[PDB]
Symmetry: C5
Subunit: 276 residues, 5 copies
């Protein structure tokens, strides 16, 4: 009663979590999804801050420290009970157990995905009004522009597979937190699995619903003083469009995200510990 | 009974905390507010110490390590029960529940804000008498001068939004500590959320009530040996005035601080878990 | 009842773990072995990510930080209950106690080894489809090529002894986690012992069932744009063949792995605490 | 009963600690004071070791890592129950409660201060006999000489105020450990507050009773091979005398140390939580 | 019952530990001593790995990180119950209490010292067969050669005093682990005290029974390709002999080790908390 949960018990807590989430009031789900969109946006802002000025640093060392900074948003989601689309894909365990319906799964996923977008877009506005892009002599905004520009240059299969790898890591972090009982147990078990996906360039749909939109805003409304300082032009980031974001990144990464956490984490552990 | 609190229970502990704080004796509130002004001043002195000599270092890596150093002051506030204006804005949860009155909220906020200023100003005196500005051949005082000078060059909207972002981070750190039961749980859950706001250049009213006043004192009473060593003049910091501090930074950052923690952390979680 | 287990009690939990593992359903053992093959593959991908760009860094400092990144896969195996061939060699404690049969030990080892290979090979496919080898301008794939190429140049005795050293470290990490009761205890006790084997270049059979196969795939299907960027040719990695992998690395490292954990960790602790 | 102590309860544990310490047998107090003098000496030796060779490093980053190394001595004092003059100043809480007499407070302070000096001086002897000053080609002894030389060049007010700041940090670390219940809680809560005072150049009387005496011994008995390697002469450290130590540093820093922890930590918390 | 042990209770657990250790079966003591010789050998191999390539790094920063790597071996000894000669010197507390006889103390010390040598020498063989000396282009073996060569150039008094300082640190780490109740408490309380002795160049008899023997083996059986790569000759390490090891290092460091932990940690704490 003070010891970590075992893999069979962690599977039952995952099942009850999905029964709770899918049966919560819709507006509560939307409000918790807006907080999770804001939490993932804060974590990406922390990642961009920590990775500003790190071109002289070893590539993997810079990516790792920024990945530990991105871990805050997932810890916030778990401790504060926010609804993140990636983690909410694990309600498939409750679906496989027949404890929830397909319409309950579909309505919860649309509520969380849409709310996560509203929260991520609201944080872009506040981040734009803060003048943060001009930090480090515009190097903060150039980091966002360069991060957002690469996330739109992947092929469909590359984006789907990068999404599978990201939600596998996120859902394994959320699954391992089920074993935890304290706040330190749950939080620290999630640092390394998130650092990994962020350092390894895996794609998360909600994280990208903040990064690419923010880079599109910088390219469009950045000052000429920004372009002078960073020594570039908006035409170097011409492919940073809303349509390129949905087609090139959002659609394939989201498809991959569902497959990663749903099939690999959720349905595997249901087969091993719950199908019985 | 050994496990972390859940989001609904954390909301009730936030409500009872505000009922406690707003109903404490006024002089106890003033004395705890002076300690919190001193605690935030110590954390900024630690930030300045850690970030002295870091112009050769990657911008975000230097900001992150100084942000972990600033986390000490918030941990001190939480463990030692000090009254910080930013965290005391969460007494709006008790106000929304009708458990406290508007005059109780207004009197507690003025008591904490004024006491936080007295504590921050008392630490400036002790820091000035210590000769700390001449540390690192005056590089410690130049770090304070350069930090204080930028905090006065923001537009009203930029300062308000930077204040919203800071108190959102501070109040989310304080909210997540409510889940904690041990000293390690509460303290470590607050490191990354504070590092973020400090590394990301967000503005905290009480932190600025120490930084800018300290930079004004250095500009005015620094020795000619200081200006020789740092290779600058007081005229490079002409906009570091008390009037510029209140108008350019204090008023807008404080307005933003109330909106960040009160509306975003407090009233959101009251709607989701307490409005019932 | 809240204190760490003592060496005698940790030996009994090791015995009961082997009785559980060897008596689990075969398909459950195969499925948990596929997850462990994927978990060790994720840890090596994290190691490669963190160690990309670190030729300018001190050799041991770069190896140590990548070793902490590889620790995630073992933590995942322990918390999520996955079957790793290295840790499953400790079922020899149950065999020595006469609590399991030799055919039970042989069938479990073949089930785990084969499943660990399937999981490691499935992750190579996903990693190849992600385009990750072209990360850091191909420096990610060159790190894999250079890591895989050295792991095939050892003599039989060197490979056997490097395998003994690796499984001694892995099984001592798994043994020390038996003392732990919380998730933080079990996880953190395993970081330094795994970092050591990874930093010290010891050889793990399942880790190599991902690294060398992945390097063979890069050498064979890498783009000419990859070879241009990394400034090399596939002929620099001619000895990266499937046959060289089995003979030069897989067979001797696996023999060594059994001796390291089975004889040194398992049969020693059985003699001291269970032979009674 | 598993949760951290609250500020009111931490004040009562501080009161009972002072009643215990002031009423312990005098020889037990002297022996525990000699251990605390040795513990603070070990922490300064660790600080000097970690900060040797760090002139190429950013000033604050080098000071911070050495400050975490100095934290060991305070952790040792708290866990092993040693009597450190700085922490024993908090017996003023028991004095203010009328639970101890003024003669009990005076006799305990003289016993601890004298014993702390004996322990610090005994460690200087062992450190001198070890030949440690010649480590890093004499750079270890030059670090001690340069650290000790600056600690004697402060004005009386600067030294008193640097002593107030040091014992405020030390006594706040000791106060926050009262909230802790486990060994990890108590130890980790004391790392950042001690790192701060060490990184920020604050002055501790017992730490200086090891540093300056050790630098005086190096200046006087260092080999000519030492002066050749470090490229200096004893005449560069002419002000490192026993009389300069007492007048320039010991007397004012000790006065400041009493004011810092006694008045600021002890009498403040007694007014807020115990004067009732 | 969940709180750390107090200094008086930690003294009684130290007394009962020595009564257990000295009364264990001799062959169990020999087998646990062989594991401790292997555990300290692994920690030194980790130290050498982490400190390879660190001549460009600040001396103290490199020594500190390698010292955290050496901490693994002591954690392993404590968690896995191994018999290390340094920690077994604390059975003097049971001897002083009259709970064990002088012949029991002498027989246990010889059993542990001899077994620690067998384990350290067995790990040298495995490390030699692994080809690890050629790691980092022979820089791993040169680090061992340079570490082993300096450990033989100390005077008798320097070696005795460096041994006193090492076992004081090791026995204080073991004493502080007695306060711990969890695996994280016991393990983390031992990291900084061990890092200190390793970073500060203190001498441990069992650690040296692996380092110097390993350097003698490299000097004697290293390939001419090793000497070419490292750009040296065996004649640069002529004083690395077995006879120089015993006389110059083993005998004086062991004498010092007994005095450090026995008299300073054991007999002091027995006088303060057990002589009653």
């Amino acid at each position: 009663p003070f010891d970590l949960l075992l893999p069979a018990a962690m599977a039952k807590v995952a099942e009850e979590a999905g029964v709770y989430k899918a049966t919560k009031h819709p507006l509560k789900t939307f409000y918790l999804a807006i907080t999770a969109g804001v939490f993932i946006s804060i974590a990406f802002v922390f990642y961009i801050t920590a990775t500003t000025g790190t071109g002289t640093m070893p590539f993997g060392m810079a990516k790792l420290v920024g990945g530990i900074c991105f871990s805050l948003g997932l810890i916030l989601c778990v401790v504060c009970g926010a609804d993140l689309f990636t983690s909410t894909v694990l309600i498939v365990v409750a679906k496989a157990s027949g404890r929830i319906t397909w319409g309950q799964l579909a309505k919860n996923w649309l509520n969380v995905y849409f709310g996560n977008l509203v929260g991520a877009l609201l944080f872009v506005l506040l981040m734009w009004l803060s003048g943060e892009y001009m930090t480090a002599n515009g190097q903060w905004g150039l980091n966002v522009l360069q991060t957002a520009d690469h996330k739109v240059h992947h092929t469909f299969i590359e984006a789907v597979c990068l999404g599978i790898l990201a939600n596998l890591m996120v859902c394994l972090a959320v699954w391992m937190s089920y074993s935890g009982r304290s706040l330190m147990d749950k939080a620290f078990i999630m640092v390394l699995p998130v650092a990994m996906f962020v350092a390894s360039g895996f794609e998360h749909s909600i994280a990208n619903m903040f990064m690419i939109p923010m880079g599109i805003v910088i390219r469009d409304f950045a000052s000429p003083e920004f372009w002078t300082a960073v020594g570039s032009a908006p035409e170097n980031f011409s492919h940073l469009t809303v349509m390129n974001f949905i087609t090139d990144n959002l659609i394939p990464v989201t498809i991959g995200n569902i497959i990663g956490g749903g099939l690999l984490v959720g349905l595997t552990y249901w087969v091993i510990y719950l199908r019985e």
